[PDB]
Amino acid sequence: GILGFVFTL
Amino acid sequence: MIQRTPKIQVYSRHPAENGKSNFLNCYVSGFHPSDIEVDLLKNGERIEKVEHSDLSFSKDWSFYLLYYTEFTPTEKDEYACRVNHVTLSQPKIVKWDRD
Amino acid sequence: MSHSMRYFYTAVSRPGRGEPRFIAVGYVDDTQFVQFDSDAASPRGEPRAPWVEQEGPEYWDRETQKYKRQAQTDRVSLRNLRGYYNQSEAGSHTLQRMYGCDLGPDGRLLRGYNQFAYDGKDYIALNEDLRSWTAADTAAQITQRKWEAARTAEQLRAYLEGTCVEWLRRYLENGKKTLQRAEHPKTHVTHHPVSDHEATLRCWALGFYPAEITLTWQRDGEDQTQDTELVETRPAGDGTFQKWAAVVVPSGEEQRYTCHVQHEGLPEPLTLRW
Numbered sequence: 001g002i003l004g005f006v007f008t009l
Numbered sequence: 010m011i012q013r014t015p016k017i018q019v020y021s022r023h024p025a026e027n028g029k030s031n032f033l034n035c036y037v038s039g040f041h042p043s044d045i046e047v048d049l050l051k052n053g054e055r056i057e058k059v060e061h062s063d064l065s066f067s068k069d070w071s072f073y074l075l076y077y078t079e080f081t082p083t084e085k086d087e088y089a090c091r092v093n094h095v096t097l098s099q100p101k102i103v104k105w106d107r108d
Numbered sequence: 109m110s111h112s113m114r115y116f117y118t119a120v121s122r123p124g125r126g127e128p129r130f131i132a133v134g135y136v137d138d139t140q141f142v143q144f145d146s147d148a149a150s151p152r153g154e155p156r157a158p159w160v161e162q163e164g165p166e167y168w169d170r171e172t173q174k175y176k177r178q179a180q181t182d183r184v185s186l187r188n189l190r191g192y193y194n195q196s197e198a199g200s201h202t203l204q205r206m207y208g209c210d211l212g213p214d215g216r217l218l219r220g221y222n223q224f225a226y227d228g229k230d231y232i233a234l235n236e237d238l239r240s241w242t243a244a245d246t247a248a249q250i251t252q253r254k255w256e257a258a259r260t261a262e263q264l265r266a267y268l269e270g271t272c273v274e275w276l277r278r279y280l281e282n283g284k285k286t287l288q289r290a291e292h293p294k295t296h297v298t299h300h301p302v303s304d305h306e307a308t309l310r311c312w313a314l315g316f317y318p319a320e321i322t323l324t325w326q327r328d329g330e331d332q333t334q335d336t337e338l339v340e341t342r343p344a345g346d347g348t349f350q351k352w353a354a355v356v357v358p359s360g361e362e363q364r365y366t367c368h369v370q371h372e373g374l375p376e377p378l379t380l381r382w
Contacts, residue, residue, distance in 0.1 A: 001167075001275040002115060002132070002174050003207070005263045009185040009224065009232070009251045011228025022344050023314070024296075036342045041228040042202055043120055043131075062343070063143035064131045065116050070204055070225045072118075077345045108298055108310065 013071055014096035015040040019089065019105045025082040033080045033105065035090030038073035042095065047076045050089040050102070056080075082107075109372075110218060111137055111287070113276040114208035119182035121190075121201050128186055130179030136279050136287055138318045139347060144175040151176070159283030189226055192247035202227050207264075209272035220268030238265035290373030291317040291348060297367060297382045302356060309382055310354040311367030315344065322370040323353035327361070 015037040022032035033056075035047055043064055049056040062075040076090070088105040114135050121128040134142040141157040148154075153171035155161040186203055195201070207222035222234040230244040232251050239261050243252040255261065280287055293313035300308045311323050319341050325332045337354045344350050357365055362382050369378040 003267050004174050006181040007260050032345050063133050065133045070228050075343050
């Protein structure tokens with residue numbers, strides 16, 4: 001199951 | 010900006026025996042960037058129903074893909090894998106060698 | 109023994125040819141279980157193993173939703189990276205990510221990881237402690253400053269030490285027959301004359317799982333590692349792997365050569381002869 005928290009470089 | 014050329018291996022899933030159903034593989038690896046075209050050839054002509062793995066990559070970040078089709082080898086039929094990539098001036102053809 | 113779950117993400121911009129493509133694949137050990145491709149006819153999380161196929165539509169819809177959200181996000185990251193490096197609008201660029209976790213014989217976390225590359229080069233990596241970063245260059249130091257301010261590592265550490273492991277554990281239960289068994293290589297040795305004084309001996313290993321293997325030619329019991337052609341380990345297409353190792357030998361000396369095969373699925377290493 002993938003990480004659900006996202007964020008940009 | 011990395012540019013790395015594909016390593017190509019063409020091989021069968023099981024040791025080839027004439028008249029026995031099998032799977033022909035072309036494994037392309039070690040390449041960058043990710044766009045690539047891969048064809049499997051039978052007697053010089055493109056094999057129609059060819060499937061492939063989804064794009065993945067190795068520890069050094071270089072990409073790899075498996076292209077494959079079911080086939081039944083015979084004594085005379087010749088198979089090859091043809092690949093094109095930004096690093097190649099012309100599509101590169103690797104012939105299948107049973108060993 | 110121990111197991112891993114790893115995700116691999118690739119986002120590729122293509123200015124003037126629509127928005128960047130996003131492709132993800134997931135593995136438990138050496139077994140693919142999922143893929144998502146934004147360019148797929150229907151972009152959805154796709155099962156690739158029987159032991160996630162029995163996960164119901166809710167699990168799949170949630171995975172799909174998260175993949176789409178990730179893909180959009182990675183498109184913003186590509187935009188940001190173009191800016192950091194003062195790169196033109198027109199060129200195509202690649203962002204890769206790998207992350208995952210490993211667990212041990214007791215089902216407990218061993219380690220987690222999360223690394224990023226830009227245009228095929230190391231960009232920024234979460235350090236082994238899961239609390240700090242290593243930036244490869246000046247631009248990556250910007251991302252470091254940004255993630256330090258935002259405490260991004262805390263989010264990543266919580267997932268990697270917690271939910272990543274819970275998933276891995278669940279998948280290991282569901283796919284035990286597949287996942288917790290090694291398959292020994294099937295071997296054979298071939299021979300080809302090369303000239304009036306040399307021949308090639310080729311040592312084959314087929315059908316093995318996991319991918320890790322060592323093939324070594326020896327002469328009189330001693331390694332000839334420096335003189336062997338070793339091919340990269342390659343997928344058979346059925347979830348197993350293949351490799352071969354070849355050595356060119358003086359014709360007539362073949363009886364002194366042995367191929368040594370080491371693999372998890374072997375109780376003892378093999379010694380083979382032509």
